[PDB]
Structure 1
Amino acid sequence: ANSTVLSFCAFAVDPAKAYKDYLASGGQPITNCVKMLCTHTGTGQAITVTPEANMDQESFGGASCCLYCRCHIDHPNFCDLKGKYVQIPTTCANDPVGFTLRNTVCTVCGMWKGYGCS
């Protein structure tokens, strides 16, 4: 499943939009991101140097979520995710990749705009 999806997006002139369109067609989210095991809740920050999932999130290994790293192609913006950990609201933890693609980290508090910001 992931190969068809990742293949389709990898060669599209715009990977991000290929995925977006794909999901909009009812396509299945990219699975197999790595979930981090935490013994304590963290700051709840979007992207961090160490796992920081709080009561409402889950922490995945950065690269594991970066679509470009997953598609093995160059970056738009290096995975400003690679080597770090991404916190995702649990309600959206079903599509980590798509999530970071569709959201914005707050520059002030550093949490997802719309989910735990301000």
Structure 2
Amino acid sequence: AGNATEVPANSTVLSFCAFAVDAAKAYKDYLASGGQPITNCVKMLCTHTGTGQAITVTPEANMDQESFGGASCCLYCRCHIDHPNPKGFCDLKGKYVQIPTTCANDPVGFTLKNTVCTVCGMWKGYGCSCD
């Protein structure tokens, strides 16, 4: 019964990251040694008009960024492991995320590395009003 969920092109990555002790560094070492990034993420459809703020309640892209199903970007939420947020749940479960179309091939890697500036609400570098 049930419903299948992952395509065979993700088995090694998901296993090796669900057994590791530091999921983040594990995934970074995986990529950094010739790995194929994760890839059945849910992809949205919208207007590419609105705030550049990736974290949002409703797909709000610009002509450059690209809306994604948030929950399917938190690696922690993807491998079914616990989150390092001291308390106590992932935030990207419920929202949408918008990633620069350039780097928006690997969503999980970006979500791991970059962060939104608290002021401009946008990615530090893509872009930020601060300084």
TM-score using structure 2 length: 0.86
How far did residue 42 of structure 1 move? 2.1
| Deviation string, structure 1 residues 22-68 (Cα, Å, up to 9, x no partner) | 00002111111111100351211021111111111111011111101
How far did residue 11 of structure 1 move? 1.2
Which protein has the bigger helix share? 1
Q: Which has the larger radius of gyration?
A: 2
Cross-structure match for 1:87: 98
SS of residue in 2 equivalent to 1:86: strand
SS of residue in 1 equivalent to 2:105: coil
What is the alpha-carbon root mean square deviation over aligned residues? Answer: 1.0
Distance 2:116 2:109 in 1: 14
How far did residue 111 of structure 1 move? 0.4
| Deviation string, structure 1 residues 42-97 (Cα, Å, up to 9, x no partner) | 21102111111111111101111110111011111222100100010000111001
Distance 1:2 1:114 in 2: 30
Distance 1:106 1:40 in 2: 21
Q: For this pair of structures, how many residues does the alignment match?
A: 118
Runs of 4+ in 1 over 6 A off after TM superposition: none
SS of residue in 1 equivalent to 2:78: helix
Moved more, 93-102 or 42-51: 42-51
Distance 1:53 1:100 in 2: 16
Conserved? CA contact 2:48–2:63, under 8 Å: no
How far did residue 104 of structure 1 move? 1.3
Query: Which structure 2 residues correspond to residues 39-54 of structure 1 after superposition, within 5 A?
Result: 39-54=47-62
TM-score using structure 1 length: 0.95
Conserved? CA contact 2:48–2:65, under 8 Å: no
Ranges in structure 2 where 5+ consecutive residues have no aligned partner: 1-8
SS of residue in 1 equivalent to 2:17: helix
